[PDB]
Scaffold this active site. Structure first.
Site, short mmCIF file in Angstrom:
data_model
loop_
_atom_site.label_atom_id
_atom_site.label_comp_id
_atom_site.label_asym_id
_atom_site.label_seq_id
_atom_site.Cartn_x
_atom_site.Cartn_y
_atom_site.Cartn_z
CG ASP A 224 32.77 24.72 8.38
OD1 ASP A 224 33.67 25.58 8.36
OD2 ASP A 224 31.63 24.92 7.89
CG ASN B 11 23.34 18.52 -3.74
OD1 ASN B 11 24.54 18.77 -3.62
ND2 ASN B 11 22.78 17.41 -3.27
CB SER C 34 26.19 22.06 -5.43
OG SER C 34 25.25 21.51 -4.52
CG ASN D 278 27.66 20.52 -2.05
OD1 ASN D 278 27.86 21.73 -2.14
ND2 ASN D 278 26.65 19.92 -2.66
CG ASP E 193 26.15 16.02 -2.19
OD1 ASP E 193 26.61 17.18 -2.11
OD2 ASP E 193 25.10 15.68 -1.62
CG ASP F 74 22.75 23.94 -4.36
OD1 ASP F 74 23.10 22.92 -5.00
OD2 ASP F 74 23.32 24.33 -3.32
CD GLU G 179 25.86 11.44 3.26
OE1 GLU G 179 25.44 11.62 2.10
OE2 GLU G 179 25.50 12.17 4.22
#
Ligand code: PRO
Ligand SMILES: [Cl-]
Ligand SMILES: [Cl-]
Ligand SMILES: [Cl-]
Length: 129
Positions: A101, A46, A50, A59, A52, A48, A35
């Site tokens: 989650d 990202n 957003s 995110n 990270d 969209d 990562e």
């Protein structure tokens, strides 16, 4: 901060990630490697809009506030900048929420694609843990 491999393994263990939600320490170290290359200051935008943040590339759409991700949540209740600190506490605490989650570590695409099902124990080999 760019952590050494065993250095990060030790910090992750101390913060309770070894076998958290059933995932061995090597899984977490492997995820961090791919990562962020163990770099707490890593950021990636990202598609969209957003972003990270940090060693585990958490995110801003769901987990942290960066003030520029419209309609986003802040489920870990922290500024995304907290995820860039040399102190990994905030990243670890937030990662524990993410991995709980429902989809386990599959939440980390790099983990699914580069770590899952591999000999992840290799990532902590040689370390004095
Ligand atoms: O993640 C693993 O591979 C081991 C097996 C279950 C508990 N942790
Ligand atoms: Cl392991
Ligand atoms: Cl925002
Ligand atoms: Cl990937």
């Amino acid at each position: 901060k760019v952590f050494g491999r065993c250095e990060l393994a030790a910090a992750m263990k101390r913060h309770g990630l070894d076998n958290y939600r059933g995932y061995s320490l090597g899984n977490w170290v492997c995820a961090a490697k791919f990562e962020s290359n163990f770099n707490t200051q890593a950021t990636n935008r990202n598609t969209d809009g957003s972003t990270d943040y940090g060693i585990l590339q958490i995110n801003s759409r769901w987990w942290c506030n960066d003030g520029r991700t419209p309609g986003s949540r802040n489920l870990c209740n922290i500024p995304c900048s907290a995820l860039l600190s040399s102190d990994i506490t905030a990243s670890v605490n937030c990662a524990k929420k993410i991995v709980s989650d429902g989809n386990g570590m599959n939440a980390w695409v790099a983990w699914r694609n580069r770590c899952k099902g591999t000999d992840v124990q290799a990532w902590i080999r040689g370390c004095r843990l």
